[PDB]
Amino acid sequence: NMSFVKETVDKLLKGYDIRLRPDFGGPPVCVGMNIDIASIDMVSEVNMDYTLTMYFQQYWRDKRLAYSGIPLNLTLDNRVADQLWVPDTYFLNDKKSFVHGVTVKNRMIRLHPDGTVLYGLRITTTAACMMDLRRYPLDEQNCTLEIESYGYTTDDIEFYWRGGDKAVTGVERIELPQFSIVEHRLVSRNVVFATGAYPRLSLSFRLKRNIGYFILQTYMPSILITILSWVSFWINYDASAARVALGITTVLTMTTINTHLRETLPKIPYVKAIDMYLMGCFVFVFLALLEYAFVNYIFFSRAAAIDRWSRIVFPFTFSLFNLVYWLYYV
Template sequence: MLRLLIIAFLTITSVFGQTRLQLKDNEKQILDQLLDKNKYDSRISPVGPEVNGTQGPVVVNTNLYLRSIEYICTKRNEWKAQITFRHQWNDQRLKYDDKSGKIKYLSLEDKDQIWTPDTFFSNSRSGEALKDLKPNVLVRIYPNGNVLFSIRLSEVLSCPMDLKHYPFDTQTCSLQMASYGFTTEDLVYAWKEELPLQVTKRLNLPEFVLEDYNTDYCTSKTTTGEYSCIRADFHFRRESSKYGCQWFLPTAILTFIAFISFWLKPNKSTRIKLLVVTLIFLYLHILYINGKSSPAVSYHTAKDCWLSTCLVFVLAAFLEYGVVHLVHKLVKPNKCPIDSSDCQNGKNVNNCEEGDAVAL
């Protein structure tokens, strides 16, 4: 009995293995037929669905997955992100028989064997396709001619920033994808209807918080034609708590210390010493702030307004000290002139006290 079971198991395994091997052989034959250079030219773009009796542009459905953000640089107005973007379109030249549903899709390792959109990131400063042991590229061909193309990239992207409210600002950084050579007569990008934009749940930024994200279109016209373009916008809010502790609290304390001088007597040297020390510490702290993390912009930011206000208040305390000191010197108590003999006798003259009398 055991012998029969073993023989049956080996027979089934052998038949299954032959079926798998035959299926792979069928896939190879199909690929050889589809990619025959005499029949398929990867330089020619596929045609789209008919519109008013004429062939329309090929529609490239796109969705994007934001894997991570390495940094958002305020000084250089740029951000670096790792993304996976996927294109899907239909190429009728790649339709094939799925062998009664046995072949779900065909996989390619070399994307250059078929036509792919000439997508580029219009606001990119530099970028590279990531690879570990092999390039992170996926190409699938489905029986109905649909093609799925996916690639993992690392991109440094431009992000113009409005820093008038810095460090209490919010910024919008975009990722724009467009066709470099195909006009809208040949190729049109469209966001996928379901989940066009996805973001990893483990996104962690040291200075910003991702508040929201959305998709949009940015088709543009140039002298060479109209080009399809899609855009993903990411809205970031700057975490300002550390700036409150490092910038605003110390400068507020120094300004308050300068106001303490109002309670000191104007003829005391301690008052001017306190103001001088306060001004020196405040000025050094402003130099530290501007030298370490101040963005290079040609306009004033909220931080500049705050620091300037603190400096003005401390300088106003100096001005107040000068005015009070001058008035204290010019204005003296009224003296009552009396005869020297009366003063020597200790008499009160004209209701003046003895201590207030001055000899003529």
């Protein structure tokens, strides 16, 4: 009967002190966590953060909410969550988190006859993971989401992953634009602060960047302009207008590429592999123009000897530099 369930619920809620956690004087309450990732909507290197969306479930035994005579698992409206005790769970590295409120506050309370309580939310977090761009765009990040209890110590509360490694789901279905989730790992620790030893859980994704964006219009055009400088070695030793225009226009193209790619890159004032590669190419075309300068000055003070030496050397030196760069950053 509906009235029977109504009086049972009122009996459970009446005299319920939300402030006191379950087993206040007793041992710590064990809260089993669970996550179902819906998507990773964004991964920005500008702010070193990524947006995650997830169904976040928390299971805990609360003997005060045990009821008998109703074999069904009661599913109450979200507002009942205001009148009960829930863990003070929070994420350390979040920058701006919120619970979705589309037509209702997206929460679920599911009681059980044995006092077990399921509290689920739909949370969109903007987590912060620091990224090293030393090997960018050949990098591999380790972005993590960490979960802790803000107030209660390990003596008061206890966290664990519900179902072991199977707790977190939906990672496989994720399809990032410029990343690939190589692996996800779950960890449980106790973190000692000045106040006391708190519990912690951690969910870490190892994201490997996909190199399809960075070989076809970043390295390829710089390489080909370097080839055109090599062509500048091949023209002549007296056609001053042609060689000078070719060299300086190649320099101009490299400067244009560098400026527009820096405008394209996500504004991280730090040295990166692409930056050293492009500066190497720029220095190479600059050295080609200097080589023509030396040839012209020496003749108009052997020009053919220096031109042939440059023809032999510059391709070899650039190939050596490219091999060194590729092996160093791989």
